[PDB]
Design a protein around this ligand. Structure first.
Ligand code: K
Ligand code: K
Ligand code: MG
Ligand code: MG
Ligand code: MG
Ligand code: MG
Ligand code: MG
Ligand code: MG
Ligand code: MG
Ligand code: MG
Ligand code: MG
Ligand code: MG
Ligand code: MG
Ligand code: MG
Ligand code: MG
Ligand code: MG
Ligand code: MG
Ligand code: MG
Lengths: 73, 101, 88, 119
RNA sequence: UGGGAGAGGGUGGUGGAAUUCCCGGAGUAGCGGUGAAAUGCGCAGAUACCGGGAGGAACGCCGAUGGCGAAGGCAGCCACCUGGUCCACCCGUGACGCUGAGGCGCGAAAGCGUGGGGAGCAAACCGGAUUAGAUACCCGGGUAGUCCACGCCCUAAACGAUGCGCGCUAGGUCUCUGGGUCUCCUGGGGGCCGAAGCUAACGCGUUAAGCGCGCCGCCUGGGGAGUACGGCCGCAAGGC
């Protein structure tokens, strides 16, 4: 379905290769640290890809989560 | 010489006594292999996403040298033998590919 | 890899004349450059069978051009080799 | 009898059985129940009902210890699951929150043949 | 010369989730497993829970209907070494081309040798069930193996069941990657639908199985048989 917003527009001008811009990247993960499906991040095939490697790169530095507990429910 | 970046997340519960005492060793090894200073940021304490080395916080030390390729990996060997240095991520610099800019 | 300066030098070291970017001489020289490298590489990583296929690609290519040289300018041929440790 | 007051409940589903575990403010258990604890023996320890009783029971052994607030945490999939959560709802305790925290690997150990058939 | 994408390969390092075991806390009677059961484990205190540690192996989400490679095959992250390939410019060589018997190299899994490793899984095997029987499917354990190094083995539904290279012959549509003056045009790649044509039909259809040319490999009713013999290769199993 995906009937809400779109992490693409719900943001501004930024660098996908930025593995230290926590506040922005944070935006690309669900309630759970799982990286976002492209058909949600609104990115392209080539962006969604850089982003990915960026995120995963940052997780290692300890700035982003590898996994979170699903609240609500 | 190739341009690299040397992310370093070390012990948050560290005093200015050894903090500066570990930043001298870092500079030592750095220039002992060939690293050359440049745009450096010492952001400082930050709450990690997950507990590291038992502690839920880290002191980040981001650099940007430009050392010899065939040396890099060595610049990482001796840069980890420290005990307060709990993370070392050196990764080649690459022009920021914007998007939605 | 092979830096631009590193290559441009060999291209002038062999060019039959100004602007000779790609001639049977340049090419062979240039090729050899690559071969020699990749070879010393495969002396260390004997398990890189992939890079190895590339070697054969290059080797053969050179044998090709050379086979031309020795036929067209029998002299230019003896020249090349007698300056590349080729044909030994 | 440390008059716990407020703690956390840990539900644990399985297509085979359910077990609840009421622990103190942080980590250390207190009481616990399961389809076993109560009556059921065979495959009835899985049935949502069993899961229900298991939760209710496990919760009363918790009232004795003077408990009021709990942080439910789920783990696993089985009829019981939400059912047990649903039982703890009534029972007689304040459910502060419900956090599904099932243990999923980032793919590491080869599962038993019973859980593969897809290589 | 200048740009580009990539799980293409080799080496070293490193990250977190998870399983097992051990350490400790807290806690009590079961856990597990199944269509039902049972074997098994648990009061020498298991299962569920929390904190710590050791270790091996594999990389969740990203992830595709996607990408790279000649094939086998290749996905955590970083660095080093290294192959292939696409594009723009039209700058240099001047037919230097294509195919390729034999040769040589690569070649999933299982298997073999020497050494190491061994968490999980698991041929054989030991048990519990099921059954008329059960040398099986289901359940509990469990060795070789699965992992690494080096050396062998050389097989497959090794499949697109479709050899390689080039030229020619409507378009539509989705998509990956590049150049452009970027409702779109051009190049490379991945799909679906279809002109002409082809096909026994199913289907193929600018990614041909169409119209052609070139070089290689192969076929010639079924069974006996991928057997026997011979040769060659292999430590063997065996392979050609
Ligand atoms: K019993
Ligand atoms: K063969
Ligand atoms: Mg633990
Ligand atoms: Mg395949
Ligand atoms: Mg001329
Ligand atoms: Mg093999
Ligand atoms: Mg094997
Ligand atoms: Mg062996
Ligand atoms: Mg087992
Ligand atoms: Mg029997
Ligand atoms: Mg078994
Ligand atoms: Mg064992
Ligand atoms: Mg197939
Ligand atoms: Mg196309
Ligand atoms: Mg038809
Ligand atoms: Mg068609
Ligand atoms: Mg016959
Ligand atoms: Mg045979």
């Amino acid at each position: 379905p995906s009937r809400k917003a779109k992490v693409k527009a719900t943001l501004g001008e930024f660098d996908l290769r930025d593995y230290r811009n926590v506040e922005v990247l944070k935006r690309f993960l669900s309630e759970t640290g799982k990286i976002l499906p492209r058909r949600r991040t609104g990115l392209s095939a080539k962006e969604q890809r850089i982003l990915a490697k960026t995120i995963k790169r940052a997780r290692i530095l300890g700035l982003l989560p590898f996994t979170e507990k699903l609240v609500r429910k | 010489m190739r341009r690299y970046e040397v992310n370093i997340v070390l012990n948050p519960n560290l005093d200015q006594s050894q903090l500066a005492l570990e930043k001298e060793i870092i500079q030592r090894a750095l220039e002992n292999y060939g690293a050359r200073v440049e745009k450096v940021e010492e952001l400082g304490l930050r709450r990690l996403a997950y507990p590291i080395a038992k502690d839920p916080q880290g002191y980040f030390l981001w650099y940007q040298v430009e050392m010899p390729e065939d040396r890099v990996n060595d610049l990482a060997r001796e840069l980890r033998i420290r005990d307060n240095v709990r993370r070392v991520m050196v990764v080649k610099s690459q022009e920021p590919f914007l998007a939605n800019a | 890899p092979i830096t631009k300066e590193e290559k441009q030098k060999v291209i002038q070291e062999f060019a039959r004349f100004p602007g000779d970017t790609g001639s049977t001489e340049v090419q062979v020289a240039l090729l050899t450059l690559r071969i020699n490298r990749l070879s010393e590489h495969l002396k260390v990583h004997k398990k890189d069978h992939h890079s190895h296929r590339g070697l054969l690609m290059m080797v053969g290519q050179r044998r090709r051009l050379l086979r031309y040289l020795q036929r067209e300018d029998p002299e230019r041929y003896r020249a090349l080799i007698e300056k590349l440790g080729i044909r030994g | 009898k440390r008059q716990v007051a407020s703690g956390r409940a840990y539900i644990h589903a399985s297509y085979n059985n359910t077990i609840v575990t009421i622990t103190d403010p942080d980590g250390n258990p207190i009481t616990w129940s399961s389809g076993g604890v109560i009556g059921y023996k065979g495959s009835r320890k899985g049935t949502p009902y069993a899961a229900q009783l298991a939760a209710l029971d496990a919760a009363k052994k918790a009232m004795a210890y003077g408990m009021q607030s709990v942080d439910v945490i789920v783990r696993g999939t089985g009829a019981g699951r939400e059912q047990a959560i649903r039982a703890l709802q009534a029972s007689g305790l304040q459910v502060k929150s419900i956090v599904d925290d099932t243990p999923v690997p980032h793919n590491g150990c080869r599962p038993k043949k019973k859980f593969r058939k897809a290589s």
